[PDB]
Design a protein around this ligand. Structure first.
Ligand SMILES: *C/C=C(C)/C=C/C=C(C)/C=C/C1=C(C)CCCC1(C)C
Ligand SMILES: CCCCCCCCCC
Ligand SMILES: CCCCCCCCCC
Ligand SMILES: CCCCCCCCCC
Ligand SMILES: CCCCCC
Ligand SMILES: CCCCCC
Ligand SMILES: CCCCCC
Ligand SMILES: CCCCCC
Ligand SMILES: [Br-]
Ligand SMILES: [Br-]
Ligand SMILES: [Br-]
Length: 265
């Protein structure tokens, strides 16, 4: 049960573009990691964990993107005018394993800026993480068959989509029922984060389906391109909005370092 990446030889332009996409993603996440670390001091204690979760996400994704880059250059060699598969192996499956950690972190930092606490926070986080883990795990099993069994990729993806929809319903319901509690005008900002999340996370099932409608070397490139757009949107851009909401609410709650931080800009 191979992946479609192992099926093709690659032109130098295709190979280097994919490598440059992954290495670019590493640099963006580690550059954002520094930003999230420095602005941590400008967030009130109640919200500071949300910015720390951005730091964990940046290193988690950055390590897996660097991992994918070197595996790409390990597994292929330029022979007779094209990059051909060598002794080693490349696989998008390590992305799925990493999602088991990064997705709960992304969801947790949203619940924190929604001002959920105590029993409701733990309760809502447990249902969301369980739904997300069911989405990822059924998706992982599905892509094992992206070459061998296209019908199984479809059926496991339908199961995965059911968890995805239920997960989004919980997220959206909590957002619209707790919007009134949010400070500094961030009741307007949080609805924008929900829509950004809808857009960015939907890119992943689209990349999952690439083997069904573009099973060639250019579809390998398009999938990595979609992953890159989705990774930056769902982690970096999303994290900046979460951090903005965290600081804005900190300032409205009387945190002086937050108020000063916004004043200078
Ligand atoms: C930073 C990485 C993120 C936010 C990854 C998100 C992943 C998903 C939303 C996964 C979606 C899937 C389905 C809805 C159906 C097909 C299989 C998956 C696992 C790709
Ligand atoms: C600003 C510190 C970010 C530097 C990123 C390092 C890129 C490593 C590419 C292998
Ligand atoms: C207030 C407790 C949060 C529960 C929201 C809905 C959970 C989904 C059960 C599937
Ligand atoms: C289709 C997944 C979208 C779920 C959003 C529902 C939010 C409305 C709650 C009032
Ligand atoms: C060996 C492929 C990577 C999957 C990790 C469980
Ligand atoms: C997998 C089909 C679910 C769609 C529900 C809106
Ligand atoms: C035009 C690109 C918008 C980026 C905002 C973060
Ligand atoms: C310096 C706080 C602003 C964060 C959002 C870009
Ligand atoms: Br506080
Ligand atoms: Br990730
Ligand atoms: Br409602």
């Amino acid at each position: 049960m191979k992946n479609i990446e192992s099926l093709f030889d690659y032109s130098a332009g295709q190979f280097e573009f994919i490598d440059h996409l992954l290495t670019m993603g590493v640099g963006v996440h580690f550059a954002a990691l520094i930003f999230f670390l420095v602005v941590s001091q400008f967030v009130a204690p109640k919200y500071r964990i949300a910015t720390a979760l951005s730091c964990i996400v940046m290193v988690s994704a950055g390590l897996i993107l660097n991992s994918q880059a070197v595996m790409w250059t390990d597994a292929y060699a330029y022979v007779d005018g094209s990059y051909q598969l060598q002794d080693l192996t490349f696989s998008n499956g390590y992305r799925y394993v990493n999602w088991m950690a990064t997705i709960p972190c992304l969801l947790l930092q949203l619940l924190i800026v929604l001002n959920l606490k105590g029993k409701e926070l733990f309760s809502t986080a447990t249902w969301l993480i369980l739904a997300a883990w069911g989405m990822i795990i059924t998706g992982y099993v599905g892509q094992l068959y992206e070459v061998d069994d296209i019908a199984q990729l479809m059926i496991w993806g339908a199961v995965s989509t059911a968890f995805f929809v239920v997960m989004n319903w919980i997220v959206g319901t909590k957002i619209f029922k707790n919007r009134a509690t949010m400070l500094g005008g961030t009741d307007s900002t949080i609805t924008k984060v929900f829509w950004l999340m809808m857009f960015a996370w939907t890119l992943y099932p689209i990349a999952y389906l690439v083997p069904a409608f573009m099973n060639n070397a250019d579809g390998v490139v398009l999938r990595q391109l979609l992953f890159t757009i989705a990774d930056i949107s769902s982690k970096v851009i999303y994290g900046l909005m979460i951090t903005y909401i965290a600081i804005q609410q900190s300032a409205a709650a009387g945190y002086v370092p937050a108020q000063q931080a916004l004043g200078r800009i």
